[PDB]
Amino acid sequence: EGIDHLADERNKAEFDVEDMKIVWAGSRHAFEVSDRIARLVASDPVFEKSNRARLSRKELFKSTLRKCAHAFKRIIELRLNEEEAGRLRHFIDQPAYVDLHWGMFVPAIKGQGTEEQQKKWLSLANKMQIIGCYAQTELGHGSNVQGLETTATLDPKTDEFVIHTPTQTASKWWPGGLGKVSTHAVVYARLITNGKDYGIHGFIVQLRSLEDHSPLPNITVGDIGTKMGNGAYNSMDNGFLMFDHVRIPRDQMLMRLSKVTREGEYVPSDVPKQLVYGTMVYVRQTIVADASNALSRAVCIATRYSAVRRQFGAGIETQVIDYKTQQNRLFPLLASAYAFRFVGEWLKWLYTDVTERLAASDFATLPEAHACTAGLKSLTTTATADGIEECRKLCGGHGYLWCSGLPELFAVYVPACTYEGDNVVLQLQVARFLMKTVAQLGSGKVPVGTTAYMGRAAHLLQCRSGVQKAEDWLNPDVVLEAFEARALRMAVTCAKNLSKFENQEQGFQELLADLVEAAIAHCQLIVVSKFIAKLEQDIGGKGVKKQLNNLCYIYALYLLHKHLGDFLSTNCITPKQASLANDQLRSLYTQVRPNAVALVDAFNYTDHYLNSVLGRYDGNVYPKLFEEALKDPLNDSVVPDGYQEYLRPVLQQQL
Amino acid sequence: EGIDHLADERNKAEFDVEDMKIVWAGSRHAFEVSDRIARLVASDPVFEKSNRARLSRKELFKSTLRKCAHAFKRIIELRLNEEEAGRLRHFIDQPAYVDLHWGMFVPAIKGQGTEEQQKKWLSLANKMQIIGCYAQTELGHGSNVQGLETTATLDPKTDEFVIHTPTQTASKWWPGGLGKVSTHAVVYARLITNGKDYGIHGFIVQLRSLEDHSPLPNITVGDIGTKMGNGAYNSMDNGFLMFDHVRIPRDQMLMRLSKVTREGEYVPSDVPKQLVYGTMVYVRQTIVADASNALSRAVCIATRYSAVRRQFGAHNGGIETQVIDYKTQQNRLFPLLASAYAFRFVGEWLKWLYTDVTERLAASDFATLPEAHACTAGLKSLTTTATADGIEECRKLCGGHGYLWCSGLPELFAVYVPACTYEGDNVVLQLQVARFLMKTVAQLGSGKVPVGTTAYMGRAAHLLQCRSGVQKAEDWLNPDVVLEAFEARALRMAVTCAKNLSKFENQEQGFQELLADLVEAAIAHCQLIVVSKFIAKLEQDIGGKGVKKQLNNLCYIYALYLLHKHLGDFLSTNCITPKQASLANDQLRSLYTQVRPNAVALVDAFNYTDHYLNSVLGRYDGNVYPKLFEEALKDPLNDSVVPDGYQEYLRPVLQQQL
Ligand SMILES: Cc1cc2nc3c(=O)[nH]c(=O)nc-3n(C[C@H](O)[C@H](O)[C@H](O)COP(=O)(O)OP(=O)(O)OC[C@H]3O[C@@H](n4cnc5c(N)ncnc54)[C@H](O)[C@@H]3O)c2cc1C
Ligand SMILES: Cc1cc2nc3c(=O)[nH]c(=O)nc-3n(C[C@H](O)[C@H](O)[C@H](O)COP(=O)(O)OP(=O)(O)OC[C@H]3O[C@@H](n4cnc5c(N)ncnc54)[C@H](O)[C@@H]3O)c2cc1C
Ligand SMILES: [Ca+2]
Ligand SMILES: [Cl-]
Ligand SMILES: [Cl-]
Ligand SMILES: [Pt+2]
Ligand SMILES: [Pt+2]
Ligand SMILES: [Pt+2]
Ligand SMILES: [Pt+2]
Ligand SMILES: [Pt+2]
Ligand SMILES: [Pt+2]
């Protein structure tokens, strides 16, 4: 019928959801564009995906190709701009070769290719005259790109590069859109010329004929197999690729940063390689933004279902969302979704700054921008992945059904923790940055940026919190001092133990676990500080900033409790004060409780996008669960196929 | 071919693996029977399951019926006993109706049926002349069984029970084997007679005809839909069931503890009601035991792959370091390896408890019933939660390749996770433990002292006011130092919750307000139990060169890991100082370095066949990369280099013909 059975929950909102929608979107323009394209996608039959778990691999892949072709057509017929086109693909919500073509193939050519190469290849790529992928990872090397085995040797006699896969472990493995779609690809391999290896470089290589799509000579290509989850990435043709002395023109090597003349000499271009932040600053900011998007979808579903599902506490039973355990599990995730959203905005400013930095030839803040962004990507993706699975558990047994929308969300998102850098490896980079920074404590150098709080090491290392009552934990200065002292203490303790070993790189390895935790503490401090900073801005809407303030401190006090041991080790926070922080946290859960549903409605997700029976906008769950069950292929017949051969003989006692 | 790439790793072992295998199995008999049946399943083509993710729902279900039928045949042709049959189904490793028939339907009739009911129905069930399922859960009620809406009203004039589904939410939902297989089922509904509701009772109801499998009159049954993961529980026909005033003979009501005369009189039997909890203590015991099974599988895979995978740390010109050498990898994996053994041993203890409770229960001795229930519920919650998270963490430990279905980890996680919800929601179960702990605290050792697993709660004297004597890292390897720390931490948290409760006018209101705190205290109590049982295990005589030593390493890794993970809880007691906490961390680090060379052998002790593990990354011989390529070729998407859909959806795009 469409009647909203959560209207009573929404009426509890102490703020206008419409205003919060703008805050979440980031601006009115962003909201309007996304909302329009979203409705557009939802109203198009070709983009349906509620039966995505009832199709075979082949059928799922073909259906994906169809959606992509249809999307391209709609973009042209509707004359959608870049922004709208990007939102269209976003709401189609189905991993496809197109994501890598536009997301890695093109960008790789723009930043690593010469102007002429860009003119030629970008012209073909932008008009879909060719389809490319990013072939970097191999069977034996993913995170350690410097260890790639694929080789590219120049042939002075033919002025061509010989691309070869020395061993089976040198085979490309994982590239999206490589398995069956891409006609071309940017292949990364060891550059070899004049009998010398000059490291990893990118080379454009045609994989398939543009006439029959058949693999070119000496090219071995295919899909790597089924991946985790029903649907999810299985719509993507992640593939492998091997070269048997494949030849490509010399000028097919991306030569913006370095080039190889006809003579075969390697010549590092005069371009500042420090401008390679197009693959590790903006890209990671989108990853951090994607985390808020993924987490918000999961929290939206779990919040609505928690307000619908009643169990125990009876006549009528209590809504599970009323239970403090449900809140202590769900509300921190709702706070994290907003926290990551805002930290994602700050990362947009950092990009505009780092870009502003590579202008005046200032590379003084690059080291911090690298570790900061790397640590944030690791922190948010990890927290988001865990939160999505937790949201599934918060839905009890029904969350185990695919139609709940949670199982596939986790499966499709989890790769974020590995691609573009293993989460642990990335945090080790932050640990190295923090150790190099602490090594400056007492040197006289004034640390700036996210490490500026290290200048107050004198006070932070010997502090004592002035907290005397629960409400004191709502003071930004009190919370910030707590997190800074915690992070500093942890980093200083690591540095001190690191000087207790003879070999520096040895002690580092021996303490990797402690180093990662110190790095995480630093990253959480950053997220907490950016949420507080966001609250200083002018946010319109009655009661809006009050709810954001509630979420800000729920996030901070939740992490305080989760990592209580770190704070208590610093002795700048006592157990009594920790207990008071816990009382404040509980009080914050109660204040947010009535605003819960409206806070996820602010995400403005359509039922089509959420693709969840439990998280339906109208709260009409149970009837929809039954409706979906009937659609399962196992219900195509009353008596199962296999009854006569494998059941009746048993029941009838005939073996 | 036949080379063992992990040969060197296995030579690093500082203990004899063959002896550790016996420890894991529990005995030489258990080990022998399992090893034999395991090989028997692996060698049978009908039991292939590495292609499971390439089957449609229908083909997967049909294949499941085939495997179960073949199992019945093999048990008869091989003349296998009950133990062997159980091990057979265990290694077939495929969720199916058979699990509920033997695991729930039968146990229900045995513990709730009358002597006359048991020999009539169990004779049918044991011979499989009927196939039953456990139909309790409904759309609207799972954890809260007392809230079930299905009704069973007696009809004196016909001597029948009228089973009915009041509303859509009253529909049975989730029962394994109900969807398409079961012909009968034990249905739970509110017993209605003489115009009174007497609560939830069990009733036997026939769902399908034994001649053509057609649903009986007024019976609406079907499958509830596709579940999380490729394969996994999708071979199981979990279903829904609605009754439109279905009628069954009055004698089809399980009447061992409750009778209903021909005149509709509700009369309790002479059998103690508590003589039913004996089965749940069993089912929960099997769940805990299952936790070690699933966790060890995941850890075996991640441990072997961690020894094969090399990344970064290149020394000898290109020779990169095995990831298992990195402390972060060890800190994430070794605690799970330690937990696998910890859960195995706590599972052994829970078995002993099952018997003990069952014995005394047969003598109307319900003195330890309250404790038995708390431990079981809490351990079921603790182990399943830790195992589920541990399995997913093992997948992340395998980096990118762990995302491939052929790594064996994605399906293992999906098939295992239901463990955190079935038999009671994990958080709900821990709240029951909290209530038990609060009552125990309420009884201040004045009336009858705390014994069993709560005995420590009696020594609140020095506990709530201790100061560990730890002065050196090595001190954290002392059992009394560890136990004292965990007992104090748990008792302290519980006593604090009790005090905070006492300051509320309405005790139930306070309980609800502090739910989160109560669950944390209950978890600390359950962890103490696991730690204490592992330490107790080491007090036994365990033969084998270096065997006990390695178990000792794991024992303290488990304890010290939890101490670190929940550091905040211990530092609040003032019985542990930050300096002593830092010493525990140093000891933990050292234990990792000691376990490192023993890692691969410690997972080989599980004695899993490659067929059972069904993992390319975790292959016994470590021949990962070549096998990954081999598996990729089997995907249907590789049936052709040019994908179907190319002509319609790719060519037109590449030619600007949209
Ligand atoms: C769905 C998906 C899509 C992808 N798409 C593409 C693509 O389009 N193009 C492309 O080129 N690639 C792609 N990739 C590959 C991806 O970008 C990464 O290169 C790859 O996932 C890195 O993981 P790995 O297997 O190398 O992990 P590893 O780096 O081998 O790590 C494995 C384990 O060892 C640990 N470890 C490793 N090194 C260290 C260290 N130094 N210290 C401590 N611990 C360490 C890790 O933490 C982890 O526990 C994709 C991957 C996935 C899963
Ligand atoms: C794969 C699978 C197979 C199953 N097979 C069977 C079967 O064969 N037969 C059968 O009868 N059933 C079966 N079940 C059902 C199962 O045994 C449980 O009854 C059911 O999964 C419990 O989940 P729920 O939906 O009731 O969760 P709920 O109990 O409703 O909980 C949902 C959320 O609310 C929270 N919550 C609920 N109550 C409280 C409370 N009092 N205090 C604080 N928080 C609370 C929970 O923590 C959770 O976060 C199966 C379930 C699954 C997933
Ligand atoms: Ca309502
Ligand atoms: Cl799934
Ligand atoms: Cl899966
Ligand atoms: Pt050039
Ligand atoms: Pt960078
Ligand atoms: Pt309705
Ligand atoms: Pt080999
Ligand atoms: Pt009877
Ligand atoms: Pt019980």
The structural domains of chain B, ordered by start, are 16-131 (1.10.540.10), 132-268 (2.40.110.10), 278-448 (1.20.140.10), 479-607 (1.20.140.10)
Distances (CA, A) of A633 to A597, A628, B91: 34, 11, 28
Using alpha carbons only, how large is chain B's radius of gyration in Å? 27
Per annotation, catalytic residue among A420, A481, A484, A628: A420
What are the residues whose beta carbons fall under 8 Å from the beta carbon of A426, sequence distance 6 or more? Answer: A374, A375, A377, A378
What is the per-residue burial (b if ≥16 Cβ within 10 Å, else e) of B586-622? ebbbbbbeebbebbbbbbbbbbbebbbbbbbbbbbbb
Instruction: Give B217's DSSP letter.
Output: T
Give strand pairing partners of B249.
Answer: B160
Half-sphere exposure of B482 (CA within 13 A, CB side): 31
Smallest CA separation from ligand 1 atom 20, residue: A142
Burial of B519: CB neighbours in 10 Å, binned 0-12, 13-18, 19+:
buried
Closest by CA to A6, choosing from A554, A627, A592, A599, is: A599
What are the residues whose beta carbons fall under 8 Å from the beta carbon of A453, sequence distance 6 or more? Answer: A460, A480, A484, A487, A488, A525
Pairing status of strand B160-164 against strand A239-243 = unpaired
Instruction: Give A102's DSSP letter.
Output: I
Cα(A59)–Cα(B504) distance, rounded to whole angstroms?
61
Q: Are B380 and B287 in contact (CB under 8 A)?
A: yes
Q: Are B39 and B608 in contact (CB under 8 A)?
A: no
Helix, strand, coil in percent for chain A, rounding step 5: 60, 10, 30
Chain B contact set for A180 (CB, 8 A): 637, 641-643, 646
* Tokens linked to B146: 């007392």
Whole-number Å distance, alpha carbon B150 to ligand 10 midpoint, is: 20
At residue B323, the 3 state secondary structure works out as helix
Smallest CA separation from ligand 2 atom 21, residue: A397
Listed by number, the residues of chain A in 154-183 with a beta carbon closer than 8 Å to a beta carbon of chain B are: 168-169, 171, 173-174, 179-181, 183
Cα(B599)–Cα(A193) distance, rounded to whole angstroms?
43
What single letter denotes the amino acid at residue A397?
G
Closest by CA to A346, choosing from A157, A529, A599, is: A529
Closest by CA to A514, choosing from A569, A591, A554, A560, is: A569
Distances (CA, A) of A173 to A57, A395, B390: 19, 36, 26
Closest by CA to B131, choosing from B156, B98, B103, is: B98
* Tokens linked to A147: 């260890």
Cα(B372)–Cα(B454) distance, rounded to whole angstroms?
11
**Measured from the CB, is residue A507 less than 6 Å from ligand 2?**
no
> How many CB atoms are closer than 10 A to CB B194?
12
* Tokens linked to B212: 């053509």
* Tokens linked to A236: 């993507």
In angstroms, this model's resolution equals 2.0
Give strand pairing partners of A223.
Answer: A239
Q: Are B554 and B594 in contact (CB under 8 A)?
A: no
Q: Looking at CA atoms only, how far is residue A537 from chain B in angstroms?
A: 34
Distances (CA, A) of B638 to A58, A232, B399, B586: 9, 19, 24, 51
Burial of B138: CB neighbours in 10 Å, binned 0-12, 13-18, 19+:
buried
Which sign, positive or negative, has the C-alpha torsion A242, A244, A245, A246?
negative
Q: Is A349 on the interface with B (CB under 8 A)?
A: no
Q: Check CB contact under 8 Å for B226 and A226.
A: no
Q: Are A400 and B427 in contact (CB under 8 A)?
A: no
Whole-number Å distance, alpha carbon A451 to ligand 6 midpoint, is: 42
Give strand pairing partners of B464.
Answer: none
Burial of B332: CB neighbours in 10 Å, binned 0-12, 13-18, 19+:
buried
Cα(B33)–Cα(B86) distance, rounded to whole angstroms?
11
Cα(A156)–Cα(A250) distance, rounded to whole angstroms?
9
At residue A579, the 3 state secondary structure works out as helix
Cα(A182)–Cα(A209) distance, rounded to whole angstroms?
10
Instruction: Give A316's DSSP letter.
Output: P
H or E segment to which residue A259 belongs: strand A258-260
Of A148, A235, A626, which to mutate for an interface test with B (greatest number of B Cβ within 10 Å)? A626
Instruction: Give A614's DSSP letter.
Output: T
**Centroid of chain to Cα B317:** 46
Tell me if B2 is assigned to a ligand binding site.
no
Q: What angle do CA B631, B69, B615 make, to 5 degrees?
A: 20
Whole-number Å distance, alpha carbon B113 to ligand 10 midpoint, is: 9
Q: Check CB contact under 8 Å for A575 and B572.
A: yes
Listed by number, the residues of chain A in 96-135 with a beta carbon closer than 8 Å to a beta carbon of chain B are: 127-131
> How many CB atoms are closer than 10 A to CB A4?
14
Tell me if B143 is assigned to a ligand binding site.
yes
* Strand stretches in B224-346, DSSP E: 239-243, 246-249, 258-260, 266-268
Closest by CA to B182, choosing from B65, B33, B31, is: B65
Whole-number Å distance, alpha carbon A394 to ligand 8 midpoint, is: 23
Q: Which residue has the tokens 């779609």?
A: A181
Closest by CA to B349, choosing from B526, B566, B605, B543, is: B526
Listed by number, the residues of chain B in 210-239 with a beta carbon closer than 8 Å to a beta carbon of chain A are: 210, 212-215, 222-230, 233, 237
What are phi and psi for residue B514, nearest 5 degrees? Answer: -100, 25
Give strand pairing partners of B200.
Answer: B190
Distances (CA, A) of B419 to A172, B320, B343: 38, 39, 15
Cα(A453)–Cα(A81) distance, rounded to whole angstroms?
43
Cα(B612)–Cα(A505) distance, rounded to whole angstroms?
41
* Strand stretches in A122-245, DSSP E: 132-135, 151-155, 160-164, 172-173, 184-193, 196-206, 219-223, 239-243
Give strand pairing partners of B310.
Answer: B322
Pairing status of strand B219-223 against strand B239-243 = antiparallel
Listed by number, the residues of chain B in 53-72 with a beta carbon closer than 8 Å to a beta carbon of chain A are: 53-54, 56-58, 61-62, 65-66, 68-69, 72
Cα(B184)–Cα(B99) distance, rounded to whole angstroms?
15
- Does the annotation count B505 as an active-site position? no
Q: Are A406 and A392 in contact (CB under 8 A)?
A: yes
Resolved by: X-ray
Tell me if A652 is assigned to a ligand binding site.
no
H or E segment to which residue B339 belongs: helix B327-362
What single letter denotes the amino acid at residue B284?
R
What are the residues whose beta carbons fall under 8 Å from the beta carbon of A158, sequence distance 6 or more? Answer: A247
Breaks in chain A (C to N over 2.5 Å), named by the residue before each, are 314
Measured from the Cα of B309, ligand 1's closest atom is 30
Tell me if A373 is assigned to a ligand binding site.
no
Closest by CA to A599, choosing from A240, A319, A339, is: A339
Cα(B132)–Cα(B128) distance, rounded to whole angstroms?
9
**Measured from the CB, is residue B432 less than 6 Å from ligand 2?**
no
Q: Which residue has the tokens 């090597």?
A: A253
Q: What angle do CA A172, A176, A178 make, to 5 degrees?
A: 60
